[PDB]
């Protein structure tokens, strides 16, 4: 998901932001821009942050594409689905921003590895260091950059891998998991994936506290026009991510007005549904607390009121 920094105070009207986003998602596949700053994220939840809903993805590194060849490679990756080779990521990687994320992790891993019971009491002639001086020196001598991570990986690879596999829980899932959770429809597989995983937490509207089933239900009534494509994805190809990445990147729901108006529709639909649900619930609760009858009549009223509010025909009309 691509965006630009606002700068302005009052967030543009819904149509203004729709227009701004529609021109960013060019109708051919390539975003409009000369320089890009791409944060690569895996699944997982960050720790120590307080928000309405917990996070779904977690950044791992940051790259900047500004050169013509780098920008061309990124556009090819975003438009068709061709993988990015490690050379480009190593050349465009932003070290300062990348290693600010893996800053406290190195310290925690160093403390855990070095946490063997200390004594700091050898005394002798010149063998007496302070109780807290040992950890102070260890942290002072630890480089919170590529050096420290490289050393930890070289010497303690198993521990580092185990620790990193727990900060990014669920980061290793197969193509079938993605197809089943967010699919099987193309529109769902694209829009719901992008919203639930990436845009819901960044935008932080009223739809950031709705689960994946609710988001798929909302996407069901996003009944924008279709345009049959030649062929779809199939099994025996889900052993790799290449086929699904090509299928999703080259979709018509990934650019233009289709991809520019789903986040807006989510909020519109949620507000419209709540507008009716709240009023009906208020009516039901007011009548619930003042009805003076009997248990049989009270149960009759409860179920009759809920049927009158939410019988299948009324839900279909709504």
């Amino acid at each position: 998901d691509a965006y630009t920094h606002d700068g302005r105070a009052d967030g543009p009207t819904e149509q203004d932001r729709f227009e701004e986003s529609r021109a960013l998602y060019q109708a051919s596949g390539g975003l409009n821009g000369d320089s890009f700053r791409v944060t690569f994220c895996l699944l997982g939840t960050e720790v120590g942050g307080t928000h309405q809903a917990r996070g779904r993805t977690r950044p791992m590194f940051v790259c900047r594409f500004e050169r013509a060849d780098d920008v061309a490679a990124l556009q090819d990756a975003l438009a068709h689905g061709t993988p990015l080779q490690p050379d480009h990521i190593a050349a465009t990687l932003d070290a300062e921003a990348t290693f600010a994320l893996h800053a406290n992790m190195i310290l925690a891993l160093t403390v855990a590895i070095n946490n063997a019971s200390p004594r700091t009491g050898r005394d002798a002639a010149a063998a007496q260091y302070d109780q807290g001086a040992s950890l102070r020196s260890l942290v002072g001598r630890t480089s919170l950059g590529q050096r420290g991570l490289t050393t930890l990986y070289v010497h303690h690879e198993v521990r580092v891998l185990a620790a990193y596999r727990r900060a990014y829980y669920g980061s290793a899932q197969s193509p079938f998991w993605f197809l089943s959770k967010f699919g099987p429809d193309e529109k769902s597989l694209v829009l719901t994936t992008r919203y639930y995983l990436l845009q819901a937490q960044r935008l932080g509207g009223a739809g950031a506290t709705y689960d994946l089933q609710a988001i798929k239900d909302i996407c069901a009534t996003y009944a924008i026009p279709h345009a049959p494509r030649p062929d779809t994805v199939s099994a025996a190809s889900l052993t790799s991510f290449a086929a699904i990445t090509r299928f999703c990147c080259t979709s018509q729901y990934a650019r233009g007005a289709a991809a520019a108006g789903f986040p807006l529709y989510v909020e519109r639909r949620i507000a419209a549904d709540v507008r009716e649900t709240s009023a009906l619930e208020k009516f039901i609760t007011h009548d619930r607390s003042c009805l003076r009858v009997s248990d049989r009549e009270f149960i009759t009223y409860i179920y009759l009121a809920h049927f009158e509010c939410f019988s299948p025909p009324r839900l279909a009309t709504h």
């Binding site: 609760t285 007011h286 619930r288 607390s289 009805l291 009270f298 409860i302 939410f310």
Partner: protein
């Protein structure tokens, strides 16, 4: 029969033992390709008859005699744990010795006496086929009964069993944590409560698969409506959330 009667393909392919993940992945991918291709050719050659043909596959030599399985030595095959929400089918029993089950019995259970006595006279293992069709051998059930009298503890007895049960009949109490499909209830006239009938009547999805030996509503039953009044009075509370 014709000259080609034994699937000569074997005379040309020799799969060696596995190696590091790279070697293992290469072997599995090629074998899966070969297996599907033969399936495609035979399916193309015949069609549905090949699809529903009886089939089997085992790592070692296994012979099923009556209710028993005969095998040389069960070695290899991934270990796992049997679930409680799973449905299995009892295929038979076996006397083939498994080192993994025996060695752990030595490990987890500090009682070597039971380990040696069981080793001298071993008990058969139960062979189960899961829903998908994988034969499994399940370890025995050993429980240690330690009695606490005045905080004095003593593991006096051990019980070795199989730990399997059948859904053909149970008590009404054990059915309150279960979901059933067809239920036939046998109430006792006189030792009857209105809440035992509510629990037994609601184990199924439809009333077309429900039978009872008497009408619990027409007989003398015990009623305890203490919780029901609390639930009913919460439905009149403006602060309680009611969700349909």
């Amino acid at each position: 029969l014709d000259e080609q009667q034994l699937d000569v393909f074997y005379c040309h392919y020799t799969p060696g033992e596995p190696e590091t993940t790279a070697a293992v992945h290469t072997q599995f991918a090629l074998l899966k390709r070969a297996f599907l291709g033969r399936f495609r050719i035979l399916q193309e050659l015949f069609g549905e008859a090949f699809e529903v043909a009886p089939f089997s596959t085992y790592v070692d030599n296994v012979i099923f005699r009556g209710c028993e399985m005969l095998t040389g030595s069960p070695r290899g095959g991934l270990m796992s744990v049997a679930l409680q929400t799973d449905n299995y089918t009892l295929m038979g029993y076996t006397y083939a010795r498994v080192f993994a089950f025996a060695d752990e019995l030595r490990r987890r259970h500090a009682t070597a006496n039971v380990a040696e006595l069981l080793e001298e006279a071993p008990l058969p293992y139960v062979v189960l086929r899961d829903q998908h069709g994988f034969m499994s051998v399940v370890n025995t059930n050993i429980s240690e009964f330690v009695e606490s009298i005045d905080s004095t503890e003593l593991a006096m007895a051990i019980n070795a069993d199989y730990g399997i049960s059948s859904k053909l009949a149970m008590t009404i109490t054990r059915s309150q944590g279960l979901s059933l499909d067809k239920v036939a209830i046998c109430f006792t006239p006189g030792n009857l409560r209105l809440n035992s009938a509510y629990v037994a009547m609601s184990r199924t999805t439809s009333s077309e698969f429900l039978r009872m030996n008497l009408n619990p509503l027409r007989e003398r039953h015990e009623r305890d409506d203490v919780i029901s009044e609390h639930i009913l009075s919460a439905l009149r509370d403006p602060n309680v959330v009611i969700v349909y």
